[PDB]
Amino acid sequence: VGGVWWFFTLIIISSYTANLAAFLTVERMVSPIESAEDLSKQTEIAYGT
Amino acid sequence: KYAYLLESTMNEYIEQRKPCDTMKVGGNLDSKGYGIATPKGSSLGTPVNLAVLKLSEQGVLDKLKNKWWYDKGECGAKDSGSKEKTSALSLSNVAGVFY
Amino acid sequence: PYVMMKKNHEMLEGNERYEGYCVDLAAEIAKHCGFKYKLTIVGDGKYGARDADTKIWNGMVGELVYGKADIAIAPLTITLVREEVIDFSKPFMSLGISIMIKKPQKSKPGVFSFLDPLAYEIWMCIVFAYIGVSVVLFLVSRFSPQSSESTNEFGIFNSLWFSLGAFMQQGCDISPRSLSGRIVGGVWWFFTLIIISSYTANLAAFLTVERMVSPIESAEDLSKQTEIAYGTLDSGSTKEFFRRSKIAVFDKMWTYMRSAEPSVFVRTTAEGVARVRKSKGKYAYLLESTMNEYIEQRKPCDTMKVGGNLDSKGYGIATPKGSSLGTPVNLAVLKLSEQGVLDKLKNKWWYDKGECGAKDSGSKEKTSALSLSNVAGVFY
Amino acid sequence: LAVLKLSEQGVLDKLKNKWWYDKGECGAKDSGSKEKTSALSLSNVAGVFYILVGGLGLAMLVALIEFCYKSRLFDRGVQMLLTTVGAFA
Amino acid sequence: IMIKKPQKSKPGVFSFLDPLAYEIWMCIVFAYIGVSVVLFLVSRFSPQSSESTNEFGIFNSLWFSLGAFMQQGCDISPRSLSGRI
Amino acid sequence: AFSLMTIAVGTDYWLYSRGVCKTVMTHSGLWRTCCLEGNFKGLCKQIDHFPEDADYEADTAEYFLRAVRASSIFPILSVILLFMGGLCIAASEFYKTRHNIILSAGIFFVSAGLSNIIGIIVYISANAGKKNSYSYGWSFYFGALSFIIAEMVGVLAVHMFIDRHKQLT
């Protein structure tokens, strides 16, 4: 039980710490509403022509 | 709180030109085209019909498009995607771990 | 999908035989314009580009010059040289030249992908090193000196447990106490420092650059490859578009189309589709924009569209020059554009035949959270 | 004058790379355009395996030479002397 | 000048110690012997339960410091204020 | 463990890869490489450490790795130490009550695996450097099993020697 859970630990931790610098510094945009169908289902905003 | 609708070559011209604080989302809801207009029955209609096809096949309208939308406005983000830089951590990056 | 015959085409005859985009388009024209139509396929098979000096553009336009056909509701490029001989209406689709290539086949899924940053030989030779060190650490620790050899806690099964504890980095409660036993435990510590850190460094590498890409995904990339040859449809306006080349990268493309070993041209676009699939990544084919996205929605989804359109041309309904029928047809193109029908007819034939179902918009982001399918092996 | 014409439009720039490079077949210019990540092979990491078997060779050897010693620093009055020679050196 | 290509270079047998230069591997071993002799000298200062309580001889202090460097710690810990520094 | 190795030294299906058979799949080995799936089939050729476009000159790393490989000194030493270990087992019945030949046996069985494990590595490391989609057959898995069986003998040789001097105790 201890030997396999150690091998479980060695994979999950190394898959965790593989790119931990980038997931704390993601710098992505939110992109709230798009493609005029989310515009059809989110009417808090105002339209204009 | 305000999402404005306009034409495609306006929205690209706004977003490329500074302060560049809007975003073009989605595609074209209805596709349409600007056309050079002449009076009906004019003698100056038929070479005009030929002249646009001259500029499009030779690549002038492509060359006119790459000239004008680059010359006036350039928001810096459109060509800054290739640059990658590294930075230190901040305490704002890991603050829930302290919490 | 412009005009292609029904599945029961041998049973049916007449205008009910053919279907497609233009057949639905020809129904909507006469619905608004008020005539009755009859479909005649050309015996050529080529769209009808420039003639071989004979000047009767061999194809559709030769049927339009000869007075054999009245209108051309057909995929036909509105370019300059076709305009001087026949009339076009306003365009009903917008499309450009596009490079179509093979899939990279760089997907590579796995269930045991956690064993990937080291090879199978090393994961074998780790186990051989694990057993070999564990018995040497035993054979050292149990010699002739209650008994003073009983002071050591190192049986063989404790030696199996010590070498696993050093390799898994967790450490053990027991530790060697003799000078000969600290040599075997000391070198195995140096072994598990390099081998584990080779794993943790390369597993970071296989979790940053795991992606599918094509190396020739741009216009200038395709221009510079003599390995990836490229041709287009014979007797088409695309072939005529490179005959009258202007730009330096377009002139560079026209050099390799002349000096082609062997001849890169095909008689039909689908023959060029079949040529890329037989080439398996070593040949590219430049065809239309609306044609390329229809190839993606068909079987067996082994093509991809790389790069944007080279230009922006269109297809138009064509009449011979000076025809009275064709001026309300020009209004009929503008009507089907205004009531969304040209969108809706394009919404018809490009939606229902989406058997591929990928809708590959792609994720250009590199910071992807690990799915459970990536590391489901260690849970097993 | 015709050479001075062609050099200024860049024709000789256009002619030289076309005949030297494009007629040539060596693709070392775009071989480095793509880069890959591979698994570690045993040819890459074998010196650590060489130290390990070399470490096990030393480990069995010291346990043997000490054992034959038992089957069949030191003496304080001289360890002061080794300190003096050590302090001098 | 024209030469034949190097055609490539294989990574060597001992290529694992390439991320650090050979000045560092000298200075790590010098830091290894430096810490091990000090850690022995700190814990043995003549206070049997006198002078024999600590396990840290010179041969144990070699084994603690190499244990602490290879990321697998050992049983013995300094258990004194000047030793734990 | 002696019989598994002496087969694997003699037999020649250690490696399955695309290669030539007279100078496409091959019955390669330490000494005699052979061939299958061809017009020739079984026309075995004694392999050579070729310098023709190997282009190694005074490469003390590459020359010594291949000279050990061309000699195969580690699998042969894995035989010689393993037979002398078996000679100590035969000399446990005769010349008995000496009790140190049982210690002496377990050294040779463990060191046969140490001769085996680095003989595995100098075979694999000299191999790569293309031969895509190579296979290791089942001759290589005999020596893999000849590793593990020889260790458990060297295990049980020690555990008998434990009981020999606990009898003296």
Ligand SMILES: NS(=O)(=O)c1cc2c(cc1Cl)N[C@H]([C@H]1C[C@H]3C=C[C@@H]1C3)NS2(=O)=O
């Ligand atoms: N984008 S597309 O190919 O689907 C497409 C392209 C075009 C369409 C309709 C569609 Cl669906 N109609 C327009 C039409 C509207 C008016 C301007 C040009 C014609 C008359 N032409 S277009 O701009 O060539």
Ligand SMILES: N[C@@H](CCC(=O)O)C(=O)O
């Ligand atoms: N619709 C096109 C097909 C040929 C081509 O793409 O060049 C035409 O008739 O011009």
